[PDB]
Design a protein around this nucleic acid. Structure first.
Ligand SMILES: Nc1ncnc2c1ncn2[C@@H]1O[C@H](COP(=O)(O)OP(=O)(O)NP(=O)(O)O)[C@@H](O)[C@H]1O
Ligand SMILES: [Mg+2]
Length: 420
RNA sequence: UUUUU
């Protein structure tokens, strides 16, 4: 496919991001928990966290005034050479929480850039999230000698291998296409001093564990390396599995682990399978701009997108059955307003940061409450408000009624009797 | 099922 190359104009490099909301201040009212031995103190300002000036400059140009709770706790820990497990609600700044200190460390204590040997490997559960992280990295490393780069499936192995063999300090990647570059020995980890697993709980779950074990357990892995794990959810059982790959690690949690973001007004409707589509148009007809509808299957996303567009709703979709180029273009169109409605499977439930997403609709409830938390988290980020509407079907979503209630109470939302 | 060479 050969995806479009990223521009270098500071106007584009800094076009990605959401402006802090009116509730930004509410962040410090959130309880903080830290566990571990001699954990460095939390920094209170970007200009007092031992960050290289280049980095701080890019932060100011990115529009940040105050670090968020996880950034305050995470930055000093990473800067200290410590391993980290960080939990913080969706849209609360976790990406910068690990890029700033890592990027800063690359300039502060430089090592020669070898070929096919990255100094930082950041892994992602989805392709679009990989490129998003990739662009934030370019944003924070803007106007420096640092070379980023990204590797992910659905693209021509040649154009990526190309960009990489020019040498990259930081490599963002999805598991599959990385194990490919690795089994073909074009990529090796002798110089990898930072291994970051974004959406870590997902990277370590049944789906990805084997591939993830192989990556981190590779015979080529530099014995001395920091391992950082971040996520808005982290089931205890997965936190135990993570520990095997962490050394004397610090644990930080802002708020309730796996807790939903309190800035998203959540509403749950009791709808039956065949009553869902009219309800959807009912809602979209009332207001359709900036809405993402989450469905259960790939075929379902495509069917619904086609339906909606035949009814005068500028709609596009994203899921695994579309060409990688269509997946990227669909996000493009949603970001610049071309498309007003985005239909998606959980391929877009985690980490995506889209300014236009003003409403999240769970057309189909997910089977796991954690997936619910990430999905509604695509809205109401950075202290801003947001709404999430979910269609609860008694015919099949009884199993998640219990966890949904807890998440609802836990985020200060109202619980409808039918869930009880 | 959804992701993931
Ligand atoms: N300190 C800050 N001040 C203002 N805005 C920020 C700040 N830090 C990050 N942001 C922005 O807010 C959005 C949320 O950051 P992001 O790193 O995607 O959060 P998250 O915690 O990773 N979310 P999720 O991946 O859904 O759990 C991004 O647009 C950032 O640009
Ligand atoms: Mg994230």
């Amino acid at each position: 496919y050969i995806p479009p190359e990223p521009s270098n104009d500071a106007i584009e490099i800094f076009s990605s991001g959401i402006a802090s909301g009116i509730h930004f201040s509410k962040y410090n009212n959130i309880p903080v928990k830290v566990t571990g031995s001699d954990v460095p103190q939390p920094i209170q300002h970007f200009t007092s966290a031992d960050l290289r000036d280049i980095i701080i400059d890019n932060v100011n140009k990115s529009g940040y005034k105050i670090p968020t709770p996880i950034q305050k706790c995470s930055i000093p820990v990473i800067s200290s050479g410590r391993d980290l497990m960080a939990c913080a609600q969706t849209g609360s700044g976790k990406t910068a929480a690990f890029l700033l200190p890592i990027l800063s460390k690359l300039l502060e204590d430089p090592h020669e850039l070898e070929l096919g040997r990255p100094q930082v490997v950041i892994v992602s559960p989805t392709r679009e999230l990989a490129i998003q992280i990739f662009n934030e990295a370019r944003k924070f490393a803007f106007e420096s000698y640092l070379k980023i780069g990204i590797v992910y499936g659905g693209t021509s192995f040649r154009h990526q291998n190309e960009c990489i063999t020019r040498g990259c300090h930081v490599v963002i990647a999805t598991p599959g296409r990385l194990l490919d570059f690795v089994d073909r020995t074009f990529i090796t980890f002798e110089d990898t001093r930072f291994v970051v697993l974004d959406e870590a709980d997902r990277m370590l779950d049944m789906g990805f564990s084997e591939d993830m074990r192989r990556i981190m357990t590779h015979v080529t892995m530099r014995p001395e390396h920091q391992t950082l794990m971040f996520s808005a959810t982290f089931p205890e059982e997965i936190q135990r599995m993570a520990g095997e790959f962490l050394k004397n690690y610090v644990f930080v949690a802002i708020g309730i682990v796996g807790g939903a973001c309190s800035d998203v007004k959540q509403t749950i409707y009791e709808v039956n399978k065949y009553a869902k589509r009219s309800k959807l148009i009912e809602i979209l007809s009332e207001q359709a701009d900036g809405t993402i509808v989450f469905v259960e299957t790939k075929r379902g996303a495509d069917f619904l997108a086609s339906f909606l567009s035949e009814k005068e709703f500028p709609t596009t979709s994203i899921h695994g059955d579309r060409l990688q180029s269509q997946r990227e273009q669909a996000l493009r169109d949603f970001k610049n307003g071309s498309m007003k409605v985005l239909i998606a499977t959980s391929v877009a439930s985690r980490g995506l940061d889209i300014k236009n997403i003003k409403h999240v609709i769970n057309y189909d409830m997910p089977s796991k409450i954690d997936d619910y938390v990430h999905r509604i988290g695509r809205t109401g980020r950075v202290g801003n408000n947001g709404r999430a509407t979910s269609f609860f079907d008694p015919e099949k979503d009884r199993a998640i009624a219990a966890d949904l209630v807890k998440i609802l109470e836990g985020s200060g939302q109202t619980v409808p009797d039918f869930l009880r």
